[PDB]
């Protein structure tokens, strides 16, 4: 059950992401992904793949940050999912 290993990895990526996300996005006129608190909620619906479109990126890097949260998140939930199936 080295799943907690992903929980760790992801929660960081969520934070890592939300910090860069705002950094990459600001400066780009019209971006709304420009404050930590929210960017953080973005990073979650993104890593959980729920994507509501309430917020998202428009700058090449913000998008690079995105792609990384998504994956890591898909990866994370995968391992954490697989683990739950074994011990149950």
């Amino acid at each position: 059950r080295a799943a907690g290993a992903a929980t760790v990895l992801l929660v960081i990526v969520l934070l890592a992401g939300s910090y860069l996300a705002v950094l990459a996005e600001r400066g780009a006129p019209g971006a709304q992904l420009i404050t930590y608190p929210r960017a953080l909620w973005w990073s979650v619906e993104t890593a959980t793949t729920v994507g509501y479109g309430d917020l998202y990126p428009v700058t090449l890097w913000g998008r690079c940050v995105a792609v990384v949260v998504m994956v890591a998140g898909i990866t994370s939930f995968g391992l954490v999912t697989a683990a739950l199936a074994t011990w149950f």
């Epitope: 910090y19 950094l23 600001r26 400066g27 006129p29 019209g30 971006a31 420009i34 404050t35 930590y36």
Partner: antibody, heavy 118, light 108 residues
Amino acid sequence: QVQLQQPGAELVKPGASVKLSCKASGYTFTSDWIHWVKQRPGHGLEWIGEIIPSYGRANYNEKIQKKATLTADKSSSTAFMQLSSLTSEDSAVYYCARERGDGYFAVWGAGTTVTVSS
Amino acid sequence: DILLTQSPAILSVSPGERVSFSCRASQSIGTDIHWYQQRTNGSPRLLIKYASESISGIPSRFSGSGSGTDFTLSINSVESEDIANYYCQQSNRWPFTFGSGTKLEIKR
């Protein structure tokens, strides 16, 4: 205690440049952004630009001619705004302000009155 | 960029009367509006954040409301110390922008 300290005034001859300073104290976070706002006498507040000390990146108001260059010294917790090639149009009070990355200016400096004259 | 319209530019009220400052955004900005007070020769001071959130240290007299494109800053029972210029500021989209300001005038 005063969170943001700015010098009272700066006299600059037309065409010359000046470097304004903003010394910050109190809690400091990696998410802090230091903003600069210009206000001409009798007029409103105009956003100039912002900088994130923890990373060093700066953004500027695209709607106005770029007169400023922002930098920050982490060790001295001081932010700087270099204004170059000034004219009387640049005469105004320049405020620095701190934002905790959450959208509002929690605190403002007292402002530096810049006068461009010979 | 988001344009913030503050009209009227001057508001005249009698002592102890309730007053309301208006701020209209060119597009919907949710509740990402903040209000500042600036007295003669003073620096701006945060009064209300995110349209209606109180700031510690500010008199209960001050309150805000609205969402979307229309916002209001209200003062219950105005007094002399409230004489100043009031500005709104948005943080929904980059770059942050300021309204042009409304001056409060008291008719004594």
